[PDB]
Structure formats: C-alpha cells, structure tokens
Amino acid sequence: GRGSMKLTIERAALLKALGHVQSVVERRNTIPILSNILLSAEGDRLSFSATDLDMEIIDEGFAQIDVPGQITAPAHTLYEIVRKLPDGADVSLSFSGDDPRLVIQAGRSRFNLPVLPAGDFPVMSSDGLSSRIAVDTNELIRLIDKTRFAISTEETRYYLNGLYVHTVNEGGETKLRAVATDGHRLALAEMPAPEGAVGIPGVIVPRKTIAEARRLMESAGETVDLQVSPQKVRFEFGAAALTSKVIDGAFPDYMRVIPRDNAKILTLDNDLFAKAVDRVATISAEKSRSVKLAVEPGRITLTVRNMEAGQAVEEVEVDYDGEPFEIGFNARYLLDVCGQIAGPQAEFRFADPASPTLVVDPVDPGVKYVLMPLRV
Amino acid sequence: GRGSMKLTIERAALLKALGHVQSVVERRNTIPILSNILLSAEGDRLSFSATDLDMEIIDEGFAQIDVPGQITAPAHTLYEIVRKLPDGADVSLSFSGDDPRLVIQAGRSRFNLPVLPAGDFPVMSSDGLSSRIAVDTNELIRLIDKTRFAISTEETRYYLNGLYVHTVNEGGETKLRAVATDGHRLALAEMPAPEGAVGIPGVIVPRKTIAEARRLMESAGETVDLQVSPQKVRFEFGAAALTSKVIDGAFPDYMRVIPRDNAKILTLDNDLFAKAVDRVATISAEKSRSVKLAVEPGRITLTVRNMEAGQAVEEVEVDYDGEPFEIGFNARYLLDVCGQIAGPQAEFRFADPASPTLVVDPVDPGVKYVLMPLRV
C-alpha cells in the first residue's frame, strides 16, 4: 500500500513535536495532503514536517523504532488526539498492508486515521540560502517584538504584510535592522549585525512566518541560526526549523518617512501617560478611537470623545518648555508605541500638527517609532 | 433640568455595585433608557438599578453624599470607565443645571456622560410575591449547578428555556425540586424543602435569570432569600436583589419521561469513563458527536467515528453482569451528566437500546439524569 512503520514514542515528546509543526497547517485546504503532517521514522528519530506551501516547519523527537517508514496523517486531528492521551503513556504509531490507516494507541485507546503517501508530501528546497548566521535569540526576539505591531494586515498591500529585514551601514558600523509599516505608522529596531550577516539581501519576511518563528523562539537556546536568499529565509532553532518564502515585492523607502529634524522635544512618564490615554479612550467603544493632545509647557491635556456626547479629559504633567499646540493620534497606534518603550521615559519629537511625529526610547537608542497625526 | 446630585464613593465599592447590576443590561436596546443604570443617592447610600424589562437587579454601596438625587447613565460605559480608574481613588459623581451630564472624576480624570431622567426609569413591582423564604445558599447553588446544563436554548420552545422550580410531596416529605429539559435529555435535583417553602406555585425561572442569580450567589452569605408568585420570582442576596418575570407557559409532565423500572444496572468509575468518552470523541470536530457503547459483562467498549474514515475505540472495565447490548448517545449529553456526578461512581440503569436511560449518583440520591438513546 505505502509500506510499513512501527514505533513507540513518549507522549510528551510526540505532543511537543506535533504542537510545534501543527501551527503552520491552515484550517482549510482544497489540497488534502496540505492538512497533513509528514511522519518519517528512521534509526531512533521520528521526524515531523508540515507546510502551507509558503513555509515548512520541521521538528524531531526520540522514538523506539521497530520498523522504519514514512507516512502522512491529518495534523490537527493527530495533535488533538495526542493531547487527550493519558499523561506519561507511551504511544504506539504504526501502519501496514493494502488499506493502511495510521494506528495510534496508548493505554486502552486505539485511533485509526486516514493517510496519504509520503511521496506526495511537498518538498521545500533550501537551494540558494546563505550559510547559517548565528543570531542571539534574545536580540532576535527584540527585533521582532519592537516592530511586529506595525506590520500591515491589509489585504490591499501585500508588500507591507511582512517585516523588512536587512543590513545597513550606519556610519561605519553594520546593523541588522527590522522595519515594519502599514502606511499609518512605522516601527524600526536594530542591533549590531551578527558576525557573517553582512552580504545578505534585504527581504520582507511574511507576517505569518514572523508569528511562527517568534513562537518557536520563545523556547529556543541562546542562538537561532538564520539563512537568507532573495527567495527564502530559514530559521534553525535546534530540533525545529522553519523555512519560508519571502514576499516578492518592493518595501517602501522608509528613510524618507522617518523625520530627522523634529525640534519640539517632549519627555514623559510612559506608564502614566499610557494609562491616561487608555483611561480616556475608554469613553468610546469605536474601532479607530482618536485622542487629542493639547500640549503646553509642563503639560499635556488628553481628550477623547465618542459619538454619543460623551467626553473624557485627563491632564498629564510632562517635561516640555516649547510653544503650545494641539495634535491628534489614533489611540491604539499611540498605545502600541508606549507598550514597547523599555524604561520609565518616552521622548516625543514634534514639528507641527500636520507633521509625522518621532518617538525615541532613552533606554534604547536602537528603536525608532513614527506616528502620523490626524486632523483635529 | 433633572435636579442635582453630588457624592463621592470609593472606587472598589462603586466598581463592585456596577459589576453586579451591569450584567442584566442588554448590548442593544431600541429603548435607550434600558441601556442605563439608575443611580439614586440618599443619606449615606448610593443605590443602583438596571433592567431588561424581564428582570431587574438592584444593589447598593456606601457613599459620602453632599447633595442627594437621582439620575440614569449608560451602564456599560460607566462600568468600563470605573474599571480603568486608578486603584484606591475616591470617585466623585455629580450633575446639575439645565444641560446636565453625569460628571465622573477621580485623580486627574474627568468623564462627562449623557443622562436620562430617573422618572423615566422602569419600575419593577414586587406585588403578589410570597413572603421571603430563607434558602441555604449552597443548596440553592446545588439545585442550579446539577440541572442548568439541560435547560433549552432553542428559540422554538420558549417554555423549556428555563428551570422548573417547584415543591413536591415525595411520600410524606416536602422537597424543593428543580427540573430542566430541552427534549433531548433531562436533569433533576431536589432538597428537603426550606421552612416556609410549601405553598409556592411551580414556576419556570428564565434561563437568563438563572444565570444572573447564580453569578450573584457565588459571593452571597449563608442564605439567599426567595420569593415566588405565579408571575414573578425574587432573590435577595443581602445588598443585591434580582426580581424577575417567570415564563408564562406549561412545563412538560416530566415524571412521564423519567424511567422507573430500568433493570439493567451498570456501575462505573465516572472520571475514568468520562475521560474515555472525551478521548474517543476527539476523533471528531463535529457538533453533535455520537458515541456507541457496546456493553457486555464487566466491560463497555466505546466507539466514535468521524465523516473522514477516522475511528476511535476504548475499553472501560465496569460492574455489570447482565446481557450484552449496544446503545448510542450524544457524547456532549453524556459528558454533561458525568461532569455533575459528585463522587467516584456513576450508576447507569438501562432497559433496551431504544429506551430512555437513567443515571443515578450513589453519593447523592437527590439527583436524577435521563439520556435518550440514538439509533445505532
């Protein structure tokens, strides 16, 4: 039929690997094998693979293998089954014969699932990729976490639905930089470039790739290996790896939209301010809630209104000695920036009420946020 | 405009009372005052009321009142505001003048909400209600928790969308009994009748009333006071009370659908069995998942299938020495019963595969569950 396979694996190890790879599997597929995990047993290693064609996750666990072989079975169902199996039970996986089903058993339970042959499972090439670049896991987390919120989810601009990862020579030192924008704001984060990074092309890593890599990163060791080409990116975590296409598109010329000479400098207590904004925004249940900042020496007055004659106002003392002005922002966009500020202060740099505004982190010079004002 | 009011109240007390009454307020209302809470300040007491016309919740907290008065303001918005106010802050509530708004302030925040006059707020009469009947809070919780799952949520049978609360003379002793059914199963729970209960009419308490009463009960003292009429029910918790219409309809003759002579008696380990059922059901993501019980002396074999050639089977040892048979149940209906069994054993009483099945709790003779079999 499709050969044979027979092994046992600890539930915890099986569950870990299934949980790692299943996430990439879409909840619908007109192509049924894309709903499946590829199981490949050899030696003392059970390998796992899943894909949505844009990316592939692979993982591996220890197994006791009586008969080596390969098969595919439905990802979600297999995962959900294994979740319900008793804690500590060893799980037998096997199939054989002319009308094979994947047989899962543990304790007094037996499940049979339909299978598709391993030879029909998609193959994701690694051709063209750079050599592996060791990246500090925590630095890689930082690049993602400081910028991820500003990635577009708008179907109408596919080229903004990813994170632009590239190297920059910033006045004699090479930086690995991440930029995300949705056209309504922008986030930038960078680090001194890892050794061996210089040479890689600038790529737009898809937003789902970012999500999946970020989740796998949370449990990785000190290093994540990165490989890049103009077509592909690959993250190696140890036992798990994620290989993905990049977005074939031009990322905007983002340096043009980051203001360099904003001269009105305002410093504030980030937590206090964010709490104020969130508080006043609570007057409204709308999606795109606006907040007005009335800035004067020593203070900012925040105002939000709803459509039903409700009003909220709060005064926040700040460090500012310039000329007064009013400016409007989308409250969520503002709050997103505040949530990424690393220390007690945030520094706003304004020009005039129609101009892009810069936010700087006194703790971390390697991040830069841009907010676009709303007509007030 | 609508008079005046001026008070201060501790945030925690304001938040507690708002949280208690807001739950009854529907998320939409074509009649705007039904979206509002009635605030009534007098002496050192701020009273709170909200309603959906079917029921009214009232609560009260301590306040320092400078100017007594009454007003209504939007329930959800007021609650959400108060949630965001700083922990420990005293909250000022006030209004006055020709174009009044409810002014809420705490710390450096000020909110203005639109108001409607207190004289337009609906009045819920307590006329016709019995005298207060003291009920043990934990017994009242038990009546609800053991039966609530079997209340209908089907729009097509409004008379099953509540809990039938009534007294019964069960061979010389009066019982307060709760019965719920959706026509697909049934749950019954009873207790020795509280002193003063005999005399009350049988009423169908609406499902949303049950939900709301049950939530308020969780923090009550040792007693909840109950009053009943053919039109209304009222729960008094202490500071809070819930007054509600009852469902104007005939509850089914439920004694006819509870089997009395089922002779095939099967005893099982409830937790083990429920875990088995849940495990095998996990083969399927369908709504109305069926499970087959193949019963023989000493054992039950459980089988579930999905629509995609998947199968799950588990054997559970049980105490049974009768003749073998197969029977089908909705897995969720079965699991609902198992979740209410109080101790390690559950006792099933079967007749034949087409007959209603009884479940008995060896720990608690005051509950009775009925499951209706599916054609297998």
Coordinates of C-alpha atoms in Angstrom, one line a residue, chain A:
Chain A
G1 CA 0.0 0.0 0.0
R2 CA 2.5 2.6 1.3
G3 CA 5.0 0.4 3.1
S4 CA 5.0 -0.1 6.9
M5 CA 6.1 1.6 10.1
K6 CA 6.1 0.7 13.7
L7 CA 7.4 2.7 16.7
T8 CA 6.7 3.9 20.2
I9 CA 7.3 7.4 21.4
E10 CA 6.8 9.1 24.8
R11 CA 3.5 11.1 24.8
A12 CA 5.3 14.3 26.0
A13 CA 7.8 14.1 23.1
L14 CA 5.2 13.3 20.5
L15 CA 3.0 16.1 21.8
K16 CA 5.8 18.6 21.8
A17 CA 6.8 18.0 18.2
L18 CA 3.1 17.9 17.0
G19 CA 2.4 21.2 18.7
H20 CA 5.5 22.8 17.1
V21 CA 4.7 21.8 13.5
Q22 CA 0.8 21.9 13.5
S23 CA 0.7 25.6 13.8
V24 CA 1.6 26.2 10.2
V25 CA -1.2 24.0 8.9
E26 CA -4.2 26.0 7.6
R27 CA -7.6 25.2 8.9
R28 CA -8.8 24.7 5.3
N29 CA -7.2 23.1 2.3
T30 CA -8.6 22.3 -1.1
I31 CA -5.4 20.2 -1.4
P32 CA -5.9 17.5 1.3
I33 CA -2.2 16.5 1.9
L34 CA -1.5 20.1 3.0
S35 CA -3.7 19.3 6.0
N36 CA -1.3 16.5 6.9
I37 CA 1.9 16.1 8.9
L38 CA 4.7 14.0 7.3
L39 CA 6.0 11.4 9.8
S40 CA 9.3 9.9 9.0
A41 CA 10.8 7.2 11.3
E42 CA 14.4 6.1 11.0
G43 CA 17.1 5.0 13.5
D44 CA 15.9 6.4 16.8
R45 CA 14.4 9.6 15.3
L46 CA 10.9 10.4 14.4
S47 CA 10.9 13.5 12.1
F48 CA 7.8 15.7 11.6
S49 CA 7.1 18.2 8.8
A50 CA 4.1 20.4 7.9
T51 CA 3.6 23.1 5.3
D52 CA 1.2 25.6 3.8
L53 CA 3.5 25.9 0.7
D54 CA 4.7 29.3 1.7
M55 CA 6.6 27.8 4.6
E56 CA 7.6 24.5 6.1
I57 CA 8.2 23.6 9.8
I58 CA 10.2 20.6 10.7
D59 CA 10.8 19.0 14.1
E60 CA 12.1 15.7 15.6
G61 CA 11.8 13.6 18.7
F62 CA 13.3 10.4 20.1
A63 CA 11.5 7.2 19.3
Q64 CA 11.9 3.5 19.6
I65 CA 11.5 2.2 16.1
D66 CA 10.8 -1.4 15.2
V67 CA 10.0 -0.8 11.5
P68 CA 11.2 2.4 9.8
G69 CA 9.0 4.2 7.3
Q70 CA 7.1 7.3 6.3
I71 CA 3.5 8.4 6.1
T72 CA 1.3 11.5 6.3
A73 CA -1.8 11.9 8.5
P74 CA -4.2 14.8 9.4
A75 CA -2.3 17.3 11.5
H76 CA -5.0 18.8 13.7
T77 CA -6.7 15.6 14.4
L78 CA -3.5 13.8 15.3
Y79 CA -2.5 16.7 17.6
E80 CA -5.9 16.8 19.4
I81 CA -5.8 13.0 19.9
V82 CA -2.3 13.1 21.5
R83 CA -3.4 16.0 23.8
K84 CA -6.1 13.7 25.2
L85 CA -3.9 10.7 25.8
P86 CA -3.1 10.0 29.4
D87 CA 0.0 11.8 30.9
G88 CA 3.1 9.6 30.8
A89 CA 1.7 6.9 28.4
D90 CA 4.0 5.6 25.7
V91 CA 2.3 6.0 22.2
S92 CA 2.5 3.4 19.5
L93 CA 2.3 4.6 15.9
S94 CA 2.1 2.1 13.1
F95 CA 0.6 1.2 9.7
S96 CA 0.8 -1.7 7.2
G97 CA -0.9 -3.6 4.5
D98 CA -3.1 -2.8 1.4
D99 CA -5.6 -0.5 3.1
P100 CA -3.4 1.2 5.6
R101 CA -4.6 3.6 8.4
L102 CA -2.3 5.3 10.9
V103 CA -2.9 3.4 14.1
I104 CA -2.3 5.4 17.3
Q105 CA -2.6 3.6 20.6
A106 CA -1.8 4.3 24.2
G107 CA -3.3 2.7 27.3
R108 CA -6.7 1.2 26.4
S109 CA -7.3 3.7 23.4
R110 CA -6.9 3.0 19.7
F111 CA -7.4 5.5 16.9
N112 CA -7.2 4.8 13.2
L113 CA -6.7 7.9 10.9
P114 CA -6.7 8.1 7.0
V115 CA -3.3 8.5 5.5
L116 CA -1.7 9.8 2.3
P117 CA 1.6 8.6 1.0
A118 CA 4.8 10.4 2.0
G119 CA 5.9 10.6 -1.7
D120 CA 3.1 13.1 -2.3
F121 CA 4.2 15.4 0.5
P122 CA 5.6 18.8 -0.8
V123 CA 9.3 19.3 -0.8
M124 CA 10.7 22.6 0.3
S125 CA 14.1 23.3 -1.2
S126 CA 16.9 25.0 0.7
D127 CA 18.7 25.9 -2.6
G128 CA 20.1 29.4 -2.8
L129 CA 20.3 30.1 1.0
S130 CA 23.3 31.8 2.6
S131 CA 25.4 30.0 5.1
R132 CA 24.0 29.9 8.7
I133 CA 24.3 33.1 10.6
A134 CA 24.3 32.7 14.4
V135 CA 21.9 35.2 16.0
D136 CA 21.5 35.8 19.7
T137 CA 17.9 34.6 20.4
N138 CA 17.1 37.4 22.7
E139 CA 18.3 40.0 20.2
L140 CA 16.2 38.3 17.5
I141 CA 13.1 38.4 19.9
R142 CA 13.8 42.1 20.4
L143 CA 13.9 42.9 16.7
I144 CA 10.5 41.2 16.3
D145 CA 8.7 42.4 19.4
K146 CA 9.7 46.0 19.0
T147 CA 8.3 46.1 15.4
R148 CA 5.7 43.4 14.9
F149 CA 2.7 45.5 15.8
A150 CA 3.2 47.9 12.8
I151 CA 3.2 45.1 10.2
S152 CA 0.1 45.5 7.9
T153 CA -2.7 43.0 7.9
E154 CA -4.5 44.8 5.0
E155 CA -5.0 42.5 2.0
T156 CA -4.7 45.5 -0.4
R157 CA -0.9 46.0 0.3
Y158 CA 0.7 42.5 0.3
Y159 CA 4.2 44.1 0.3
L160 CA 3.6 45.6 3.8
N161 CA 2.3 42.3 5.2
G162 CA 5.8 41.4 6.4
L163 CA 8.8 42.6 8.3
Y164 CA 11.7 44.1 6.3
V165 CA 14.9 42.5 7.5
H166 CA 18.1 43.9 6.2
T167 CA 21.6 45.2 7.0
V168 CA 22.6 48.8 7.0
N169 CA 26.0 50.5 7.2
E170 CA 25.2 53.2 9.8
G171 CA 28.3 55.5 9.7
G172 CA 31.0 52.8 9.8
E173 CA 29.1 50.0 11.7
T174 CA 26.9 47.4 10.2
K175 CA 23.5 46.9 11.8
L176 CA 20.9 44.2 11.3
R177 CA 17.6 46.2 11.1
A178 CA 13.9 45.3 11.1
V179 CA 11.3 47.8 9.8
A180 CA 7.6 47.4 9.7
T181 CA 4.9 49.8 8.4
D182 CA 1.3 49.6 7.4
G183 CA 1.3 53.2 5.9
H184 CA -0.4 54.7 9.1
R185 CA 2.7 54.4 11.4
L186 CA 6.1 52.8 11.5
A187 CA 8.4 50.8 13.8
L188 CA 12.1 50.3 13.5
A189 CA 14.5 48.2 15.6
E190 CA 18.2 47.3 15.0
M191 CA 21.2 45.7 16.6
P192 CA 24.9 45.5 15.8
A193 CA 25.0 43.0 13.0
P194 CA 25.8 39.4 13.9
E195 CA 29.2 38.1 12.6
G196 CA 28.6 36.9 9.0
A197 CA 25.4 38.9 8.4
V198 CA 26.9 41.5 6.0
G199 CA 26.2 40.3 2.5
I200 CA 22.6 39.2 3.0
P201 CA 19.9 40.7 0.8
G202 CA 17.0 42.8 2.2
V203 CA 13.9 40.6 2.5
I204 CA 10.3 41.1 3.5
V205 CA 9.6 38.2 5.9
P206 CA 5.9 37.3 5.7
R207 CA 3.8 38.1 8.8
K208 CA 2.8 34.5 9.4
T209 CA 6.5 33.5 9.2
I210 CA 7.3 36.1 11.8
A211 CA 4.5 34.8 14.0
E212 CA 5.6 31.2 13.7
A213 CA 9.3 31.9 14.1
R214 CA 8.6 34.1 17.1
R215 CA 6.6 31.4 18.9
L216 CA 9.4 28.8 18.2
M217 CA 12.0 31.3 19.5
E218 CA 10.4 31.6 22.9
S219 CA 11.7 28.1 23.9
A220 CA 15.0 28.1 21.9
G221 CA 18.5 28.2 23.3
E222 CA 20.9 31.1 23.2
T223 CA 21.2 31.1 19.4
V224 CA 18.8 30.9 16.4
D225 CA 20.6 30.3 13.1
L226 CA 19.4 32.5 10.2
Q227 CA 19.8 31.9 6.5
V228 CA 18.7 34.3 3.8
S229 CA 18.3 34.4 0.0
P230 CA 16.3 36.8 -2.3
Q231 CA 13.6 34.0 -2.4
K232 CA 13.8 32.4 1.1
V233 CA 14.6 32.6 4.8
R234 CA 15.3 29.8 7.2
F235 CA 15.4 29.8 11.0
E236 CA 17.0 26.8 12.8
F237 CA 16.2 26.6 16.4
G238 CA 17.9 23.2 17.3
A239 CA 15.5 20.3 16.8
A240 CA 13.0 22.6 14.9
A241 CA 13.5 24.6 11.7
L242 CA 11.2 27.0 9.7
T243 CA 11.9 27.5 6.0
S244 CA 9.8 30.1 4.2
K245 CA 9.3 32.1 1.1
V246 CA 9.8 35.8 1.3
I247 CA 7.4 38.4 -0.1
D248 CA 8.2 39.2 -3.7
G249 CA 7.7 42.9 -3.6
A250 CA 9.4 46.3 -3.1
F251 CA 9.4 47.5 0.5
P252 CA 8.9 51.3 0.8
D253 CA 11.8 53.8 1.0
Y254 CA 11.2 54.1 4.8
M255 CA 14.1 56.5 5.5
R256 CA 12.0 59.2 3.7
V257 CA 9.1 58.9 6.2
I258 CA 11.2 59.0 9.4
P259 CA 11.6 62.7 10.4
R260 CA 15.1 63.8 11.3
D261 CA 14.8 67.4 12.4
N262 CA 11.7 67.5 14.6
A263 CA 12.7 70.2 17.2
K264 CA 9.9 70.3 19.8
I265 CA 11.1 67.8 22.4
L266 CA 8.8 66.4 25.0
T267 CA 9.7 63.8 27.7
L268 CA 7.1 62.0 29.7
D269 CA 6.4 59.1 32.1
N270 CA 5.5 56.4 29.7
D271 CA 3.4 54.2 32.0
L272 CA 1.5 57.1 33.5
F273 CA 0.8 58.5 30.1
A274 CA -0.2 55.2 28.5
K275 CA -2.6 54.6 31.5
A276 CA -4.1 58.1 30.9
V277 CA -4.6 57.5 27.2
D278 CA -6.2 54.1 27.8
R279 CA -8.3 55.6 30.5
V280 CA -9.7 58.4 28.4
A281 CA -10.1 56.2 25.3
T282 CA -12.5 54.1 27.4
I283 CA -15.2 56.7 26.8
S284 CA -15.5 55.1 23.3
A285 CA -16.1 51.5 22.1
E286 CA -15.2 52.5 18.5
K287 CA -12.6 50.8 16.4
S288 CA -10.4 53.8 15.3
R289 CA -10.6 55.9 18.5
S290 CA -8.8 59.3 18.2
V291 CA -7.2 61.2 21.1
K292 CA -6.3 64.9 21.1
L293 CA -3.1 66.0 22.8
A294 CA -3.2 69.7 23.9
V295 CA 0.5 70.3 24.6
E296 CA 1.7 73.3 26.6
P297 CA 4.7 74.0 28.8
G298 CA 4.8 71.4 31.5
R299 CA 1.6 69.6 30.5
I300 CA -0.4 67.6 28.1
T301 CA -4.2 67.6 28.2
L302 CA -5.7 64.4 26.6
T303 CA -9.3 64.5 25.3
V304 CA -11.4 61.7 23.7
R305 CA -15.0 62.0 22.6
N306 CA -17.5 59.3 21.5
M307 CA -20.4 59.7 19.0
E308 CA -23.0 59.8 21.9
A309 CA -22.0 63.2 23.6
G310 CA -19.6 61.5 26.0
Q311 CA -16.3 63.2 26.8
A312 CA -13.1 62.2 28.7
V313 CA -10.3 64.6 29.7
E314 CA -7.1 64.0 31.6
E315 CA -4.0 66.2 32.4
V316 CA -0.6 64.6 32.5
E317 CA 2.5 66.6 33.6
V318 CA 5.4 66.3 31.2
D319 CA 8.8 67.9 30.5
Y320 CA 8.3 70.4 27.7
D321 CA 9.2 74.1 27.5
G322 CA 8.3 74.9 23.9
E323 CA 5.3 76.6 22.3
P324 CA 1.8 75.1 22.7
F325 CA -0.1 73.2 20.0
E326 CA -2.8 70.5 19.6
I327 CA -2.2 67.3 17.8
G328 CA -4.4 64.1 17.2
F329 CA -3.4 60.4 17.1
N330 CA -5.2 57.1 16.8
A331 CA -5.2 56.0 20.4
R332 CA -4.3 52.3 19.6
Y333 CA -1.3 53.4 17.5
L334 CA -0.1 55.6 20.4
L335 CA -0.6 52.8 22.9
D336 CA 1.2 50.3 20.7
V337 CA 4.4 52.5 20.8
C338 CA 4.0 53.0 24.6
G339 CA 3.8 49.3 25.1
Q340 CA 7.3 48.8 23.5
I341 CA 9.1 51.6 25.4
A342 CA 11.7 49.8 27.6
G343 CA 12.1 52.2 30.5
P344 CA 10.2 54.8 32.5
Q345 CA 10.5 57.6 30.0
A346 CA 9.4 58.2 26.4
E347 CA 10.7 61.1 24.3
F348 CA 8.3 62.6 21.7
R349 CA 9.8 64.8 18.9
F350 CA 7.2 67.0 17.2
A351 CA 7.4 69.5 14.3
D352 CA 3.9 71.0 13.6
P353 CA 0.4 69.4 14.0
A354 CA 0.4 68.0 10.4
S355 CA 3.9 66.5 10.6
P356 CA 5.0 63.0 11.4
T357 CA 6.0 62.6 15.0
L358 CA 9.0 60.6 16.3
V359 CA 9.2 58.6 19.4
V360 CA 12.6 57.8 21.0
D361 CA 13.4 55.5 23.8
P362 CA 16.0 57.0 26.2
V363 CA 17.0 53.4 27.4
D364 CA 17.4 52.0 23.9
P365 CA 18.8 54.1 21.0
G366 CA 18.2 51.2 18.6
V367 CA 14.5 51.7 18.2
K368 CA 12.6 54.5 16.3
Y369 CA 8.8 54.9 16.1
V370 CA 6.8 57.2 13.8
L371 CA 3.2 58.3 14.4
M372 CA 1.1 60.1 11.8
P373 CA -1.2 62.8 13.1
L374 CA -4.9 63.0 12.5
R375 CA -6.7 66.2 11.5
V376 CA -8.2 67.7 14.7

